[PDB]
Amino acid sequence: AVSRSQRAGLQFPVGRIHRHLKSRTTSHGRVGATAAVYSAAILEYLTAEVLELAGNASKDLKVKRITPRHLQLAIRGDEELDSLIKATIAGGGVIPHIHKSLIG
Amino acid sequence: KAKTRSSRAGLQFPVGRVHRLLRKGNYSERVGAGAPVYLAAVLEYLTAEILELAGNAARDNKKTRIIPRHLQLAIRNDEELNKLLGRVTIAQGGVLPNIQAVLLPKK
Amino acid sequence: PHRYRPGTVALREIRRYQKSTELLIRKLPFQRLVREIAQDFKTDLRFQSSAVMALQEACEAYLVGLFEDTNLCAIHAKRVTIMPKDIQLARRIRGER
Amino acid sequence: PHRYRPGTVALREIRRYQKSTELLIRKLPFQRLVREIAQDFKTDLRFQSSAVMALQEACEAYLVGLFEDTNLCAIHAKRVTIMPKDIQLARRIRGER
Amino acid sequence: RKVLRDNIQGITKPAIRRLARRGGVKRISGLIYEETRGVLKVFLENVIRDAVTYTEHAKRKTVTAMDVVYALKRQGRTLYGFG
Amino acid sequence: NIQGITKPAIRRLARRGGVKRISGLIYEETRGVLKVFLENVIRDAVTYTEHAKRKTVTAMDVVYALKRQGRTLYGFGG
Amino acid sequence: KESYSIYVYKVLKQVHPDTGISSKAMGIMNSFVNDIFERIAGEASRLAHYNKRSTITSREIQTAVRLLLPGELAKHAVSEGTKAVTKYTSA
Amino acid sequence: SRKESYSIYVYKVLKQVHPDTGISSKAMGIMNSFVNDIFERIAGEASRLAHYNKRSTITSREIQTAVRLLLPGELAKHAVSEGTKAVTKYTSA
DNA sequence: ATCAATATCCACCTGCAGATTCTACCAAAAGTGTATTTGGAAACTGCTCCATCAAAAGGCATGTTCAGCTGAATTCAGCTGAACATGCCTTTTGATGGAGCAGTTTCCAAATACACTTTTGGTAGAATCTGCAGGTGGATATTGAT
DNA sequence: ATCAATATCCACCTGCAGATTCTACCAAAAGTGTATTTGGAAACTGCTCCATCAAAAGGCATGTTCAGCTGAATTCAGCTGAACATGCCTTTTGATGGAGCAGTTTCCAAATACACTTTTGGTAGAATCTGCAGGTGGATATTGAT
Ligand SMILES: [Cl-]
Ligand SMILES: [Cl-]
Ligand SMILES: [Cl-]
Ligand SMILES: [Cl-]
Ligand SMILES: [Mn+2]
Ligand SMILES: [Mn+2]
Ligand SMILES: [Mn+2]
Ligand SMILES: [Mn+2]
Ligand SMILES: [Mn+2]
Ligand SMILES: [Mn+2]
Ligand SMILES: [Mn+2]
Ligand SMILES: [Mn+2]
């Protein structure tokens, strides 16, 4: 009582994120009181958004656990997530697409 | 008597300034004595490599003064520099003359 | 009345502009376009004149690069005429679309 | 007896491999190639088994990515059959050459 | 003051042709001139948006060449020649 | 070894990429590309290994190498 | 050896209490969070240095967010960040 | 105010390679962006290397590996030789 | 498009085992409280350089006419790549050891940070130098018509 | 093939905007002396990693046959390039107020730096359960043929 995450009403660990930011900058740089809070908040939000979309993907396949495939379905199917996350999702596969001129 | 660190390493490029910049960037907690030396040497070698080829381009166009055009001709005609700067734009550099063969009139 | 065949003068122009380095878009119209786009994002901006020139160098290099790639898409379809679909293929493959 | 037309099974396979996510190269050959290439850079190396898997994933995603652009290039040339010139165009426009 | 409108059409058909010539293009279909404008505007929108974000962050009212250079670097179109 | 990457395996990769009909010259072209890809990632990865004074290429070595090459991979430590 | 799994899992429970997450999927989420953090921290670091500052403040985090996220995502991210700091500085 | 630059060092190196040859200010602008760009790519990679290996200190060894990750083959080899040379010379006082 | 056979698919269940989840304990974070610092924000303000105005000129943009040759369409056949059933061997799989080796500690020598206190190289303009842009004219292609 | 009709060199010429030198403060490099880490070297673990071995299993290589796709060939409507007339608006050259960057100071609000005291998330064994992968039986899709 009381953790910085709790003060700010976040699940994500403000204390840790401050420590990481402090490591990026050095003892010769500085980190503001709230930069850790803000950063933590941004990370939690984007996490929730991906989990929200991937969770729908897994329910729509009637499945309890989110898997890499559901993460790929959710990401690649959402225009804003798709442009933000150009990384390769291990075990994601691709979205089914067959070009018009190739169908019988 | 004060003897310059660049001189101790046998360099033109400023070892002291490069050390200061390495600290200013907070790239890490400490900076070793040899890091700025080594880094100065690399930058100087790359500069030399580019001025050598740009200088040669200038001569081919019968000019005394290197311009961005010469710097471009020198970069793009060299395979490794072209790769090193493969996503860089050189203002007022132009392009290399290059016309695809199918576009030429068929004699 | 002498008359160059179609394509002779286009080849001459390629050689001419591939040899020079001058900006190929007129400066004042490009600057008005910068000012118009920027104003729709934020009112009452001023511009350093070098910032407008940096933008024009960038745009022109970008566009020349795109046309190089567009040209290879046309040639690939066994054409010499570049078309909107060549541009779009180039930008799709470049990851811009 | 029975025989599907050319293209029929092809489309069937596309649908099947676009549905699934299992790696499509066999692990042992792939692992063998990785170690061979690696040996030219540094002799006597071990590999975390996760490092080999990370490579195979990055590598399959890349080639699958590349076949997509390749296909767009073949379609652009009014073909349904990909050829090396299609791969070369895609790799060129991508800046890998 | 004065209203800014339609300045995209300042990017003329001959300027586009010229740019296409430097890019080694010999023949240009009629529809290219409007595709190119569209493509140009998007490119410029994106660089200016970033350039102005840098400007606002520095609490300036003036867009500096450095703002633009940083914007171009952000988008992987690194530009030499302007600081 | 590079021929360990077989015609049907290359065929499957193209299928996932939505390709219907494949010229016979593709399989060799693909192996050359695949080889250059691995050469570049592996070289960088080994450079990280060797910097760490290790003899064991780690998943993170590869992840850092992929990231360096703008082929960021998720699910192996970053 | 640190991870974000605990936190990812808590957030999973808020948005989908019925849903679980496989191990491999957790791996992706971890990569995701480390990636976005480095991107933002890095841009925020550059912003401060561009302006001859040594402090990464929440203000840099915000511009960094505006530079990195595509549109609706940025709007909402910015709102969440301000909401979190507001709550934090109230106490 | 004072605005530092690499211009006089570039100019020295130019004279060594081409005593007869000048450089326009615009070209010097480009050489300057070039040197900052490379400095930053190398310092950046070095910094990451150090952090990956839990090291607080960037030394010639980090710069070297960064050089090997950044430069394409032949330029890497020669840059390494020149850097190594300059360190061994520097450290022999 | 239907008459009929051949295989693909697609549901809806189902049972196993590889993964999950849950549950039980110990150190490095993470939080509190003092004390000490300091980076950068507020407050003039000197003073670049940005916007704006004017005005004269010609380089180019615009719009037109005309037809060369291009893109698009259509047709055809040699032949390349898909489909398949055949027959085999390489990859998968699953402990089992063995060992090489990543990953910890324990000194301390070497190296780096820090704090002053002198010294000097690099910078901002002033002062001098001089490459070449731009303008012109004949020599040398280059092209396109008979 | 010749030539006419233009385009394109290429070299010779010379004042001026722009580069190269020359000076004059100063910020920041370098020299010391002291305090502080660091991250190597040896002596050793406990993994994971390589290496067999050893089934059977799949998946690959193989050759045949032919559907249908790619290219080559041929036509032609009409798009787009070349040339031209006309004149607009960009470019060039200055000058001017004044916005607003930016260069020095000044003192807190906000930062680091300890010495604390708690607590949390990483870990290594316990306690289910999701869903893979099969097995049905039912349409479906696909292909040859009044
Ligand atoms: Cl803050
Ligand atoms: Cl060092
Ligand atoms: Cl089109
Ligand atoms: Cl081909
Ligand atoms: Mn507007
Ligand atoms: Mn070995
Ligand atoms: Mn201060
Ligand atoms: Mn044609
Ligand atoms: Mn036939
Ligand atoms: Mn001096
Ligand atoms: Mn001239
Ligand atoms: Mn199933």
Author numbering:
A (entry chain G): 16 to 119
B (entry chain C): 13 to 119
C (entry chain E), D (entry chain A): 38 to 134
E (entry chain F): 19 to 101
F (entry chain B): 25 to 102
G (entry chain H): 34 to 124
H (entry chain D): 32 to 124
Please give sentences taken from the publication describing this entry.
To understand the mechanism by which the H2A.Z and H2A molecules are heterotypically accommodated within a nucleosome, we reconstituted the heterotypic H2A.Z/H2A nucleosome, with H3.1 as the histone H3 subunit, by a method based on previous studies. To reveal the structural basis for the heterotypic H2A.Z/H2A nucleosome formation and stability, we determined the crystal structure of the heterotypic H2A.Z/H2A nucleosome at 2.2 Å resolution. Importantly, we found that the electron densities of the H2A.Z and H2A L1 loop regions were clearly visible, and thus the L1 loops are stably accommodated without steric clash between the H2A.Z and H2A molecules. We found that the H2A.Z L1 loop structure is drastically altered in the heterotypic nucleosome, when compared with that in the homotypic H2A.Z nucleosome. Surprisingly, in the heterotypic H2A.Z/H2A nucleosome, no obvious difference was observed in the H2A L1 loop structures between the heterotypic and homotypic H2A nucleosomes. These results indicated that the conformation of the H2A.Z L1 loop flexibly changes to fit the H2A L1 loop structure in the heterotypic H2A.Z/H2A nucleosome. In the heterotypic H2A.Z/H2A nucleosome, the H2A.Z Ser42 residue forms a hydrogen bond with the H2A Glu41 residue. In addition, the H2A.Z His43 residue forms a hydrogen bond with the DNA backbone in the heterotypic H2A.Z/H2A nucleosome. Interestingly, in the heterotypic H2A.Z/H2A nucleosome, the B-factors for the Cα atoms of the H2A.Z L1 loop were quite low. The specific H2A.Z L1 loop interactions with the H2A L1 loop and the DNA backbone may stabilize the H2A.Z L1 loop configuration in the heterotypic H2A.Z/H2A nucleosome, and thus potentially influence the nucleosome stability.
